[PDB]
Design an enzyme around this catalytic site. Structure first.
Site, mmCIF file in Angstrom:
data_model
loop_
_atom_site.group_PDB
_atom_site.id
_atom_site.type_symbol
_atom_site.label_atom_id
_atom_site.label_comp_id
_atom_site.label_asym_id
_atom_site.label_seq_id
_atom_site.Cartn_x
_atom_site.Cartn_y
_atom_site.Cartn_z
ATOM 1 C CB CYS D 268 37.793 44.193 34.273
ATOM 2 S SG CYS D 268 38.453 45.947 34.473
ATOM 3 C CG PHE D 313 36.173 54.346 34.549
ATOM 4 C CD1 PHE D 313 36.003 55.273 34.189
ATOM 5 C CD2 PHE D 313 37.302 53.874 33.823
ATOM 6 C CE1 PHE D 313 36.519 56.376 34.119
ATOM 7 C CE2 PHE D 313 37.762 54.949 33.525
ATOM 8 C CZ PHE D 313 37.638 56.080 33.027
ATOM 9 C CG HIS D 352 41.507 41.096 36.116
ATOM 10 N ND1 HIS D 352 41.666 41.499 35.011
ATOM 11 C CD2 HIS D 352 40.516 42.423 37.010
ATOM 12 C CE1 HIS D 352 41.537 42.694 34.789
ATOM 13 N NE2 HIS D 352 41.068 43.203 35.859
ATOM 14 C CD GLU D 354 41.453 37.797 34.352
ATOM 15 O OE1 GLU D 354 41.655 39.010 34.253
ATOM 16 O OE2 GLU D 354 40.660 37.695 34.949
#
Ligand code: CL
Ligand code: CL
Ligand code: CL
Ligand code: CL
Ligand code: K
Ligand code: K
EC number: 6.3.5.5
Lengths: 358, 379, 358, 379
Positions: D268, D313, D352, D354
């Site tokens: 990220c 972003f 992500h 995760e």
């Protein structure tokens, strides 16, 4: 809690109304409302140990019966209320039918929920903490025993094991703001004991009959009182045990020590436990105390007067016929039938007219 | 499980359940025998720095509501009870007790032998103590705090709870039908009374208003000169927490008033203050009077009134100036309950005529005060 | 919600199990579960306007019925659940009986409570604030009306007054993260309207039959599609209104605009309100739309094809007999009997065998 | 009736009901399409200074529990939902959502047209906003607070959420059966990885340990030097809030790390850093990527993964140095999702891996990292 006797008036309208139908009453004192109510129920002398169920959980028709009993109160109402919670009715549901303040209902519901846990965990789940919490809500050993599926003695064993006994507080008219020299007491599951028995005197305990019912009236109480006045006059330390609020026996002046308690084995044993009397009279309070004689003796209580066994000898149809026999006395022709046809044949033997005892 | 603990100065412990905010509370422990009126009691400023134990086992049956608040906040330092009901059951309830306690951030404990605690305080006299509510309550710490408590004797708490700036009070009592009334207009109240805020209960003010007084509530330390300037029809001395003795500012000013013909009436702390200013002495009681069933005899008329009591100090009757006549005594312990200046329009009651909670038996005390005022205006 | 036909199978076992017995199903979309669920109930084509009661409140045996219905589910169980709350059963009790997640039960309970308010306050009590609250919960005009003792139209007018109308949102597969050019909408009581009707073309409305049932099959839906395919080809802007999840009719590809809604007067009138079609076809979806024609025309709906009255003329047994008469056509001897004995005579007239239509 | 209101920069108002703490909240308003995992979302540090609006109407169906916390606290500035369920119905629930928000002092409103709001955000782009929960929400004040917000663009939030001191992490992932495992003995974990706390989500850490990595969590502004001293098996750069662009300290560091042969992996925010340090540029998205149904293509394999997204972003693909290869791309909008350094053991992913909440589709990305570490240790 009022005491009724509807069973004796078969044809009667048994619904509660503005005209009294009650034959007597029981009183209880507890440090909390739950404790107070439960103690009252077990001292009512109706075979209740607390909130025993009236209808089965698997009866499809149960909610209809429960509903009827709530909406139109009879003498069993208090028991139908817990049965309602057991069956899924809500507090609001019960309120709308009974008009009994939710303040009281919620408390009964909480008891049911606790009963449910007991039933679930069984005797094993009765650790000292939990058992103490139950005792504090007024649960009788007898009621716990039932839920756990054990004998009552088993629950009581357990308490002895945990040293879980009640304490005795005194009535004083003033919330303890002043001391008292009177010994008007009640049990509760608290910290400080105020019994403070005497080691001084030879004590005599007298057991009352609880609430009056037909056949178990004032006359029994009258006897109870006299025993107390007599023995007290003779120099004995008299201890009265009873929970009928209407009688002289529960007047603090009538005895040296008064334990306003349920006249149950449980309750009596705890008093004996701390008083350690010289003897206990069970012969004057009517059926209530008589029924407890054997268990008391067996639990090690110094019952005085006609032994329990003796009483039994006389009450038992069988043992009796035997004695009357032995004494060469006259006794009406009798039989013990099991079946119908058996009775017809026997009846022939005995001779009409007949007296059929259940 | 939510633990709570209560520890006394003498080390006596009481283990229970937390029913209020998490934390600790320290103060003098007292017991109150009122079976009803818990909220009113909790919000009584006189209970500032005190840990209140209620003898009636079930506290919170009726929840709480604003009309039953005797002040802007809960003054009790903590609350100790035997049992917190499952529900509040009363049409008047707006919030359950527990929630209310938490809202006021009050540390409170339930499930303890309040009877034992009561007998202990009665037998041995008041004791400071500490309640600790939280995950694992430290009894040694509780004991430390309790033992460290400076105690109420010699403590001036009046200056602690008094109003910062003076204000007007023109709201009367509550009624079932109407509830609390809209504050009256000034032109609707005949008399003007200056009341000293020593931790005044709203019921006193409301009752005064019911009787025709528009009130000017003044700071505890307000000067006699400042007051006098207001042209009072009468001067009122409120109830309040702590020792009356150390309140020099008050005693001083009262003495001043005492030089005038302005009627002076005092309740509780005010009674104590009036006596001190007249030259009598105050003592701290063994355990005090805290209840709503306390018989007080009006010695003059030989009648008994059932009263609301909330006091730990008393006026010593054996040190009374001859200018101070005894008007009432406690039928419970023979302690001083009322006095009247033989030479001045000034009197006071040790109890709470305004009750709230308790019996309305002593309300007529107010009336006598109105009498003095009317007569004073006559002149 | 599945659709059943147990009444057509008198002798069958109507309890729900692992073998399917439903004949169709309806689907509903709501901004909330409550809203979604009530919309489905009203679109079920069973004569329900929501949670219409199944048993009386004053029925002493009602708790029994409810319990059975709850414990051993039938097609009516959803209604019996609200009946349970009305009757005072708790969410837990209901749960123990049904095993339906409390998450759902609590919402039904809430609805019941609100129903109670309505009932209490009456039409007077329906201020705009509250009425809007109810609509947001999925309440139907028809439902609220029964509760308030007014005609459905009264509630509907009332909403006209308060300018209380649903908004249309769109289906887009992505929770509005992406724009859509498809007109697949549903009604909700929210803020922003997404309908954006065209002012452009002449629009034609096709009313579907809702969930299938015996006698109200795919056949009607077939027709419905064809109306759509056809007119659209012919360049009309086609708008389908249906809520059957199984069919081609509720396939966004089938029309220009698809309103996945209950085929009710209420729901339809709302669409027409913003759509203002050139005409509406009610003769193709079967009994559902058919029964709405009269009401729709009355509310100023542009019903095209055979007029509702014409329709009535044929369906009305009397209206019809008349015109057959007028056409000098052959009809079987008929009679309209009120009493039994009347029938027997009227019977004798007509001649056996006989067809008895109720 | 507990009001609450939400007003946007543009002055768009949303009237609702208060479900959390009393007060106001201000930040960037974003929308998340996740139909599950609200708790995990709230406690995602990446959300700092952001007011979160959830597309799925029913938020709170399963209550809450500690295991679903992605950090120590709720980082989201506010919560906006359609409906707050009457109850939580989940065996894992330890606390209802309202109480939980209240507990964590979060300002949050329900009952608003979250759809209308989403469409507005998607059409017009992100917007700062303000929530006001109280007795009489001031719409003007709200607008004022809303317009006054500085704006995430150019805002370093990473430095505001990072750890004070550094620390060790040896805890693995949750299991249904076992719940959250005890933390792994340090000697038990094969590799040592150093990870930059830019507002690191616990799940990342947990998934690393799950893979044999012992971790050292370091503060954001930690110096490369300080790091290289530790003799790291690999270096990790976490997710986190605000603009990656003003994070000079880390860019610099990363560059140092880039001279080494140390394996480097970013997620990220970390991915944005890795890019900047690599010489590329970032940009702020119109509305970003917030949801768990985002398709991303491994271009190399030509396979698709459903992924967890939380980023406003992005890395401009058009400014990529050549030492930076494109690995992944968003199937929704074409935007940049992954990169690998052609010349170094350094790669990163924009979504992500995760998850938590969300699809476990991108998890294997970690595997690669390990692959780099194992090979590094081979040398
Ligand atoms: Cl205790
Ligand atoms: Cl003293
Ligand atoms: Cl809105
Ligand atoms: Cl930009
Ligand atoms: K205790
Ligand atoms: K709204």
């Amino acid at each position: 809690i009022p005491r009724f006797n509807f069973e004796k008036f078969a044809g009667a309208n048994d619904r509660l109304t503005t005209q009294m139908k009650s034959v007597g009453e029981v009183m209880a004192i507890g440090r909390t409302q739950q404790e107070s109510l439960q103690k009252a129920l077990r001292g009512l002398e109706v075979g209740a140990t607390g909130f025993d169920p009236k209808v089965s959980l698997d009866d499809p028709e149960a909610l209809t019966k429960i509903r009827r009993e709530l909406k139109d109160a009879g003498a069993d109402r208090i028991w139908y209320i817990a049965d309602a919670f057991r069956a899924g009715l809500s507090v609001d549901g019960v309120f709308n039918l009974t008009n009994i303040d939710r303040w009281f209902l919620v408390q009964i519901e909480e008891l049911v929920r606790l009963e449910e846990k007991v039933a679930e965990v069984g005797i094993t789940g009765l650790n000292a903490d939990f058992l103490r919490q139950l005792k504090r809500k007024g649960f009788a050993d007898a009621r716990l025993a039932k839920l756990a599926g054990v004998r009552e003695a088993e629950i009581r064993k357990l308490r002895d094991q945990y040293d879980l006994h009640p304490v005795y507080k005194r009535v004083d008219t003033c919330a303890a703001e002043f001391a008292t020299d009177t010994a008007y007491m009640y049990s509760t599951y608290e910290e400080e004991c105020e019994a403070n028995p005497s080691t001084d005197r030879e004590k005599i305990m007298v057991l009352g009959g609880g609430p009056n019912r037909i056949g178990q009236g004032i006359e029994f109480d009258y006897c109870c009182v006299h025993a107390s006045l007599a023995l007290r006059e003779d120099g004995y330390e008299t201890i009265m045990v009873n929970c009928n609020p209407e009688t002289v026996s529960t007047d603090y002046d009538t005895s040296d020590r008064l334990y306003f308690e349920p006249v149950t084995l449980e309750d009596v044993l705890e008093i004996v436990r701390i008083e350690k009397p010289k003897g206990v009279i069970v012969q004057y309070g009517g059926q209530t105390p008589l029924k407890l004689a054997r268990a008391l003796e067996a639990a090690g209580v110094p019952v005085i007067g006609t032994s329990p066994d003796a009483i039994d000898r006389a009450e038992d149809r069988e043992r009796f016929q035997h004695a009357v026999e032995r004494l060469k006395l006259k006794q009406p022709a009798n039989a013990t039938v099991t079946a119908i046809e058996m009775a017809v044949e026997k009846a022939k033997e005995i001779g009409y007219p007949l007296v059929v005892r259940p | 499980i939510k633990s709570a603990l209560l520890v006394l100065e003498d080390g006596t412990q009481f283990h229970g359940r937390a029913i209020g905010a998490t934390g600790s509370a320290v103060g003098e422990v007292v017991f109150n025998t009122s079976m009803t009126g818990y909220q009113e009691i909790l919000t009584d400023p006189s209970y500032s720095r005190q840990i209140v134990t209620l003898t009636y086992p079930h506290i919170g049956n009726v929840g709480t509501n604003d009309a039953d608040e005797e002040s802007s906040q809960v003054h009790a330092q903590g609350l100790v009870i035997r049992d917190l009901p499952l529900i509040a059951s009363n049409f008047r309830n707006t919030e359950d007790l527990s929630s209310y306690l938490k809202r006021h951030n009050i540390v409170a404990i339930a499930d303890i032998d309040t009877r034992k605690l009561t007998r202990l305080l009665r037998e041995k006299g008041a004791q400071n103590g500490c309640i600790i509510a939280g995950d694992n309550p430290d009894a040694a710490l509780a004991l430390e705090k309790a033992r460290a408590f400076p105690g109420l004797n010699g403590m001036d708490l009046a200056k602690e709870v008094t109003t910062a700036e003076a204000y007007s009070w023109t709201q009367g009592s509550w009624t079932l039908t109407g509830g609390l009334p809209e504050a009256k207009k000034e032109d609707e109240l005949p008399f003007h009374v200056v009341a000293y805020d020593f931790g005044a209960k709203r019921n006193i003010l409301r009752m005064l208003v019911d009787r025709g007084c528009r009130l000017t509530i003044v700071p505890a330390q307000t000067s006699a000169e400042d007051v006098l300037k207001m042209n009072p029809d009468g001067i009122f001395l409120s109830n309040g927490p702590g020792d009356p003795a150390p309140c020099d500012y008050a005693i001083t000013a009262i003495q001043k008033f005492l030089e005038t013909d302005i009627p002076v009436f005092g309740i509780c702390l005010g009674h104590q203050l009036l006596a001190l200013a007249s030259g009598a002495k105050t003592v701290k009681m063994k355990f005090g009077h805290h209840g709503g069933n306390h018989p007080v005899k009006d010695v003059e008329k030989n009648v008994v009134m059932i009263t609301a009591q909330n006091h730990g100090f008393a006026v010593d009757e054996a040190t009374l100036p001859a200018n101070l006549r005894v008007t009432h005594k406690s039928l419970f312990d023979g302690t001083l309950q009322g006095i009247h200046r033989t030479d001045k329009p000034a009197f006071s009651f040790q109890g709470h005529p305004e009750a709230s909670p308790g019996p309305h038996d002593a309300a007529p005390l107010f009336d006598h005060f109105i009498e003095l005022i009317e007569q004073y205006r006559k002149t």
